[PDB]
Structure formats: structure tokens, C-alpha cells
Design a protein around this nucleic acid. Structure first.
Lengths: 44, 43, 41, 42, 42, 41, 44, 43, 45, 42, 44, 44, 43, 44, 45, 42, 44, 44, 43, 44
DNA sequence: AACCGTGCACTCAATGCAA
DNA sequence: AGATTGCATTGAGTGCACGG
DNA sequence: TAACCGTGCACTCAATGCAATC
DNA sequence: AGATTGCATTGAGTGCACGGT
DNA sequence: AGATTGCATTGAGTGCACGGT
DNA sequence: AACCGTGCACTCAATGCAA
DNA sequence: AGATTGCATTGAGTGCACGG
DNA sequence: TAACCGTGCACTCAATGCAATC
DNA sequence: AGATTGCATTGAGTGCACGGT
DNA sequence: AGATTGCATTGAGTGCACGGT
């Protein structure tokens, strides 16, 4: 299914994330997943 | 700062993350951070 | 541009909503948006 | 009957009013429907 | 918004209120839905 | 016993209704009844 | 599909039909179809 | 009285009617009338 | 076409006929036809 | 009393009547009277 | 199985027969059977 | 003393023979009897 | 066997017999057979 | 002067006649007259 | 485990490093790791 | 000036670094400086 | 393909070489190639 | 007059030979030249 | 061929040569080859 | 008393030397002194 | 097409007569 | 002294099967 | 025999097809 | 869109009464 | 017998109940 | 694991000398 | 009266390949 | 040579797993 | 139902400075 | 920047806009 994990981010990055999530209407977890997916997509 | 937080991900994503991080010699957190900054640049 | 609007839902639905959104890591607005788009079949 | 205010992309919104109008439903109803219905898909 | 009054067997009626209640819809809405939906079956 | 009730429908729907009933040789009440029963799937 | 036809009934029968239809929420045509179907069903 | 009126039926029903009437040596109208009275008796 | 024939009935019968047909909204001929079908079918197979 | 009347029957029923009458040894009029009486009690 | 036979009757009886048959809408043969049958039921 | 021919159900016939034999009468007589009796019954 | 035998009767009776026999369309012999069987049945 | 007549009967009937005659102490002729008288009186 | 090593950098470089890492919210080591991967991959296949 | 600093690298990257350095005939520190500079302009 | 060769340098030059290599973080071999290459670009 | 051995890209090597041949110098000399020039360039 | 030949120079010049050659780590011969090629290139 | 020295050059270089010497009307020795002088003055 | 009306034929029932 | 029977006559009781 | 039955003369109204309007 | 009805046709439903059997 | 509506209330959506067909 | 440092070996470049 | 050359000496310029 | 590099001693804080509450 | 966070662990990220080449 | 709500209106369903997180 799906699991959980704990991380650490620079206040700046957290801030920005918090920002991006809020604006895209996503949870922090979501946003991250999206970024991840998108990041990888653009890697191969 | 250096803030902490906990997230929830799809095994798939998680595993891929695990993979990407391992490959680039980065921690999960770092890999996330890159992705993020990266994502933001290029939106 | 992004328009705002006020609506009313049965406590029942609201909750559901609240729940679905929570699970899919979506905001209530997003959740609705999604359901809407999806719903057009 | 709980109230709440949301935000939608004009595109979505218009589509909504459209759908609602066609099915002769209020926007709130239309939503309630879509929501309950989505509950049955993915 | 046209108005009209109808007649239903208690069984049907109750079922209705039920359905409406569950889907958080007015009876009129519930009906509108069923009607539009039926339009898509037989 | 047979209960009565008053409702409101968009001119659009009403007409449709009126039409469907007419075609199936049903009264507006019957038509609804039908759609209702049927609709519970 | 379905066709049309013209008939003649005794005022009494018409009356009653009109009555039965009204009460069952059917058109005269419907009612008749029902009666027919039902009648036949109970014939074989 | 002896009132007239026009109805609409499904080819199937119609044809069956045609059949039932023909069999019982009755006109469509009559066959209808029977059916009706019959139906009413037994509801 | 439609075959015709003439018969005789006890007033009693006749009257009943008149009545039965009247009630079911059928002609005497029809009424007779039904009765007959009905009769046979009830002594059918 | 005992009156007379003229009717019309479809060849099919007529013949059938003819048969029936002949088999039970009755007149067509009698045959019909029977049928009618019987029908009545049916 | 239906069988046949020839008999003799006194004009009077024959006549009466013809008469009763006529009135009751029966064949002479039928009339006789009725009579016979009814006669039989006679006892017991 | 007129003659005539009739048709009867084997059953009927059968019983006729029976009755006749029993009463020591001819079938013709037997019948006559039946008829006469039948008739007598339809009076005051 | 249809045995035969001869008897004697009161003119009165004979006549009556002739009468009844003629009325019921039976031979004197049969008329008699009838009466006899008849008389017997009632013991 | 008290008329004679010759007849024919079924052995059975005859038989029974002689029976009833013997038992009643009546001649065959008498027995018959009785029965006839009796038969008649009834009928009336 | 995680291998360690020490290096030397022109203040210029160093500073930029400090900056780049700071901005992307990564450690100097990470920053370096990325740069390297990035570098190679861009001179990859 | 020109300062020093201690870092940590995953065997995989390290070895890779080692290779790269050797191939281009540079020191690991140089190799890294290059990579960094390059990265910057990327 | 990478090839090898042995050369001779004046202590002075050798030293300087060693020095420039050191400062620029290059191998002597690399340093030389740079030099060579750069030297070449020299004309035109 | 110290000696030492190096490694060069065939390309580099190749051009070295070329330049040397052209300038009538040994590869060692050639290089010396290059180095010295390289250096001179990194001054005031 | 690495042809050989003998020349005569100003003590002054010779010394300078010795100098430059020693500075650039080249043989007098090579030093000379350099200068020559060099002089030529500028026509 | 105006020093002598013996050297070696690549046929090509020599060749060109004789060339330039001939054209400039200078002895090989002279030509060389010129080039050297020239080379130096430049460098400075 | 399924019964009925009747003439051709035959044998026994239905009675008158008398030793 | 009616009743049993053989001798004699012909009408009753039915089959059969062609026409209606 | 006298009483039913079979039909041809005679007439209305039922039994339906059509189709412009609602 | 089925349902109402007037226009139009002819066959169904019976009365009646001379011949027939 | 249900359907159609104007009066009326409160959270378009329904209850009520006098006329209609 | 891919370059570098050097001793064993060889031939020609790099010069001094002088007829 | 520098310059061409043969005669002589040994350090420059490189290969090769075992150890680091 | 003199200048870099490789590491072991030493310490903080990042990088995550857990899980009672919201 | 994921998201917040305090409790708890240890490995990641660097400073520093003696030997080495 | 969006979300949460009390004020306000009219045909529960929405618009508005001052505070919150």
C-alpha cells in the first residue's frame, strides 16, 4: 500500500514547500510525491 | 533552520525514492530537497 | 482567474469529503475539483 | 447542513455551472453528487 | 424552477427520503437525479 | 397509504420528465416512481 | 417499434378503464396493454 | 354509450392481440374489452 | 367473411345474455363467442 | 316465452360449434344456451 | 365408442319423443339417452 | 308401429342392455318405458 | 329363453291392461313384465 | 267370459313370478292381476 | 559505510559551494555529490 | 585564499570520482571544483 | 588511446612544473598537455 | 638534468610530435618550451 | 637528419644565448632552433 | 676572441636558415645572432 | 363430416287356438 | 276347469348400408 | 305435423385507418 | 410525443319473414 | 381520484387544500 | 586499478677540437 | 680568415617494464 | 622541498523509526 | 485517516592536526 | 495564500470580506 517516513528540511525549503503545497492545493506529502515523480520522470 | 516532519508515500514512490537516493549517493531527505528545488525550478 | 464560491453540504457528505481529501492528500477544493472533472463520466 | 467556501479554476467552475445547469441541480448539489459518485470509482 | 405536486406509495417515498438523506440531497434533487439518470438506462 | 408531496424541478428536467412519461404512457408520478426504483442502481 | 389503432368501447367500460388507468397512474393505452398482457398470461 | 378512442401499442402486444382476437373470434375492440373486464376481475 | 346464423333462446337465457353482454360491453354475438370458447376450452385438452 | 335472434360467428368458432353440437347431440341453439348458462356459472 | 341400433316405437311415443326433443333442443338419440340415464338414476 | 335408428354412447348402450335384460324387456320396450316415465315426471 | 304361458283375467283387468299397454306403447307381455318387475322391486 | 290370453316372459321374470305366486298362494294368473292392479293404482 | 575524505578549495569555490548548498538546503557533501552526479551524467553515455 | 574541508561520500560516488579524477588527470579536489563550477553553469 | 613516453627536463623547469601542477591540482602529465594544448592554440 | 615519464592522449602526443618536428626540437625540448611559455603567460 | 655546423658569435651574444638557453632549459642548439623558427614566423 | 661553437639543427631549420641568410646577405653566424638578439629583445 | 331416415332381410317375440 | 304346450301366423326388434 | 333452422333483403352502427392539432 | 377527434369506408350484428325438412 | 396552483413559511423546497379535468 | 618513479639499455644529438 | 667536416666524448631523449 | 592528501580523535546535529493525540 | 511531535539512536558531516609522499 | 465564518439576502445556497493558520 503506502508507508510513512520522517525527514528534515531547511526552514527555507520547508517554507517554500509549504508554499507550493498550499498553492497547488496539496498536502506536503502529496507535493513531495509530485515533485519526486516529476523529478525522476525528467531523469531517464 | 532545520525543521523535521513526517510524510506518507506510496510504496512505489518510496521505493523509487530509495532507489534515486541510493544512486545519487544522497539521503532520502536530500533527494527530496533536490527534487523539490528542482521541481520549483521549471514548476 | 481562480474564483471563490460558498456552498452547503450535508454533514454526512462534508465528512466524507473531509475524509477522502485527507486520504488522498488533497485540499477540500482540490478534492471537489477532482471529483468534478472525474465525474463528467 | 454545513457550509464552507472553496476555490476553483474558472475552467472547472464554468464546467460545474454547466453540469449543474444541465442536470437542474444547484452547484452544491452537483458537487455532493460528483463527490458521492467519485466515492465509487478510483 | 417549476413546481408540481406528486403522489407516491409510502414504500417508495420512504425509500426516497432514505436515498436523498444518504446522498445529502433534497427530495426534489434526488428525483431530478434519478430522472436524468434513468434517461440513460431503459 | 399513498402520500402526496410537492417538489421543484428545473424547467429543463420537468420537460424531460413530461416527455419521458408521455412516451412511456406514464403519469409524472409513476414516471418518477419508476426512475426512483430503477435508480437505486 | 409500436403502432397505433382506433377502437370503440361501451361508455361503462371506457369509464372504468379511465378509472383504472387514473388510479394505477397509467395512460389508457398502457392500462390496456397491461390488461392484455395480464389477460393472456392467464390463458396458456 | 359507444365511445371511440385511439391507442398506441408495442408491435409485439399488438400482434399478440391480433392473434388472441383471431383465435377467440373476437374483434380487437372486443378482445380488449374482455381483457379489461377480465383484468378488473382479479385486479 | 363473418358467418351468420339464427338461433332460438328461452327468454330466460336471452335476457341473461342481454345482461351479461351489456355488463362486459360486448355484443350478443361476442358474448356468445366468448361463452363458447370459454366452454370448449373448459372441456378442451 | 322463447325468442329468436340472428348472430354472426367466425368460421372457426362456428365450425367448432357445429362439432360440439353434433358430438353432444344438441342443436346449435341449445349448444349455445348451454355454453352461456355454463359461462354464467364460471 | 359410439354405436348404432334400430328400434320400434309406438306412434304416440314416437310423436311425444319428437316433441320433447324439439322443445329441449336435443336429438332423438340424445333425448333417449337423457331419458335412459335419468331413468337409471331413478333407483337408489 | 314406427321404426327409427339411433346412436348411443357405448356406456349408455351398455347400461341399456343391462336394464332391459334385467327387466325382461326388449331395448325398444325399455326405452319406451324410460321415455314415458321421463315424461310423466315433467308434469303437475 | 323367452318362455311362453297362458293366463286368465277379469275383463275389467284385461281391458285396463290393454289400456296401459297401449298408452305406454308396450306389448301386453311387456306391459306385464313391467308391472311384475315393478311390483317386485317394492317387495 | 273371463278372457284368456297367451304371453311370453324372460325366464328370469317368469321364474320370479312363480316364486312370488307360490309364496303368496296365488295362481300365476292371479299374481299378475294383482301386480297389474297394483301397478295401476300407483300410477294414478 | 559512508566514506570520508578531505579536500582543498579556492575560497572562491568554497564560498560558492557554501552558497549553492545553503540555497538548495543541502550539505556541502550533498551539494558535492549532486554536482558530481550531475557532472558525470552530463558526460555520461 | 584556499581553505580545506572534510566531507563524506557514498562508495559508489567516491569510486566514480576516483575514476573521473584519474581519467582527466586531476586531483579529487580539482575534480570536485570542476564539477562544482560546471554544475553552477548548468 | 593513451600512450606513454619518457622525457628530460631541466631541474628548474621540472621544479616549476611540479609547482604549477600542484597549484592547479593537475598531474604533471595533465599540466604538460594543458601547456601543450594552450601553446598550440597560440597561433592563429 | 632530471628525467621523468608521462602519459598523453594520442591526439596530444600526435600534435606534440608534429610541433616538435616542425620546430626542429626534441619532444622534451618542445615541452620545455611550451611549459616556459605557458608560465610566462601567468604573470603581470 | 640532424645536420651539424659551426658558428662564431659575439661574446656578448653567446653569453646571452647561454643565459636564455639555461633559463628555458634548452640546449644552445635547441635554443637557437627556437629563435630561428621564431624569427621566421614573423617573416 | 669572438667565440666559436658547434651545433646541430634539423635539416628543415638549417635549410630555412641558409635561405634567410642568403636573402638577407648575412652569414649563417650573423643570421643567428640577429634572430637571437631579436628573439631576446622581444621577450623582454 | 358426423348423424339420421329407411328399404332389404331375417328370426324370434307375442298371441289366438285347442287337445 | 283353469293351465301346459305344440302348431301356426305375422308384427316387433334390430343389422346393414346407400343417400341425404 | 309444427316448430326450428337457413338465408337473402335491408339498415345502423360498430370497428378502425388517417392525420391536422394539442 | 402520444392522445383527441372529425372524415370516411365497409363489414359486424341483428330484425324479418318465405321455404324447407 | 389525482393534478394544478396560489397562500404561506423557512431554511428553492414543501405543506395545504379549494378547483379542475 | 590506472598512473607515476626509476634503473637497465641504446643511439643519436650537442659540442670541443683542428686541418 | 671565418666556415666545412671527420674524429672523439658523453649527456640528452626515450623504450621498457617491475614496484609502488 | 612544500603543499596536498589520508585518517584517527572528537562532537553535533541531521536523518529517521516509533506511536499516543488531533 | 494522514499529520504533529517528543523520545530515542547512530550515522552523516566536518574541524583538526600528526605522518606521509 | 487559501480557509473559516458571521452578516446579509432571496429564492438552503451563495456573495462578501475581516481574521486565522
Amino acid at each position: 500500500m503506502k508507508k510513512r517516513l520522517t525527514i528534515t528540511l531547511s526552514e527555507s525549503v520547508l517554507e517554500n514547500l509549504e508554499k507550493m503545497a498550499r498553492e497547488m492545493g496539496l498536502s506536503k506529502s502529496a507535493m513531495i510525491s509530485v515533485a519526486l515523480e516529476n523529478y525522476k520522470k525528467g531523469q531517464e
